[PDB]
């Protein structure tokens, strides 16, 4: 297990997940496979507390679990859950998770591009510049709302575009350390 894999996993886990996920992952990093009961006693977490965290790790498939069945010394059946980290799925899921942001970020940019500009101040309804001309009243010579028979505003549509764009831009700037770690771990 190259250290680059461990660094990437630790960076993404501490970057976008809580310390509970990071601590659990560090256990799976320190030891390739650890039993759920061992992780439970070590982390001192409750069953549902750890299970939900593990379910999250199961959700992103960053870790794999295998079930072992054996008979205890007293004759009772025992079913132990052995968890281990799957760097292949982890790197694949983060690559999707990150390239999905790019799709979502560009979707948000396309939204900032498509967010209708005109709007009615009475009913707080937003109208598209294509619909605004449909809603234009020649008698008044200005845009109005059919339901409210009131003036339609247009200038307030810049504020949400500007604000959201700052978040979108700052997201791309901060994500670069993980992208560098990915380029270092593509092999």
């Amino acid at each position: 297990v190259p250290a680059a894999l461990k660094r990437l996993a630790k960076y993404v886990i501490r970057g976008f997940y809580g310390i509970e996920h990071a601590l659990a992952l560090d256990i799976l990093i320190r030891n390739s496979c650890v039993k759920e009961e061992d992780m439970l006693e070590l982390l001192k977490f409750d069953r549902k507390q750890l299970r939900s965290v593990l379910n999250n790790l199961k959700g992103d498939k960053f870790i794999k679990c295998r079930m072992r069945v054996e008979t205890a010394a007293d004759g009772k059946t025992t079913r132990h859950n052995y968890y281990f980290i799957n760097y292949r799925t982890l790197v694949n899921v983060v690559k999707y998770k990150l390239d999905h942001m790019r799709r979502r970020i560009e979707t948000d940019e396309r939204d900032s591009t498509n967010r209708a500009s005109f709007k009615c101040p009475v009913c707080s309804s937003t109208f598209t510049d294509l619909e605004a001309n449909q809603l234009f009243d020649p008698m008044t010579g200005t845009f109005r709302c059919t339901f409210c028979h009131t003036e339609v505003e247009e200038d307030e549509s810049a504020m949400p575009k500007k604000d959201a764009r700052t978040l979108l831009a700052r997201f791309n700037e901060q994500i670069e350390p993980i992208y560098a770690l990915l380029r270092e771990t593509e092999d």
Binding site: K6, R7, K10, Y11, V12, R14, G15, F16, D26, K58, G59, D60, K61, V93, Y96, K97, H100, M101, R104, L167, R170, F171, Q174, I175, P177, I178
Partner: peptide, 24 residues
């Protein structure tokens, strides 16, 4: 343990939560 650290804005943590990974 400050070996490997990284932190992000709530907006980015919210964006991460918004992107579904398990339904694939």
């Amino acid at each position: 343990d400050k070996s490997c650290q990284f932190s992000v804005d709530e907006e980015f943590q919210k964006l991460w939560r918004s992107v579904t990974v398990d339904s694939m």
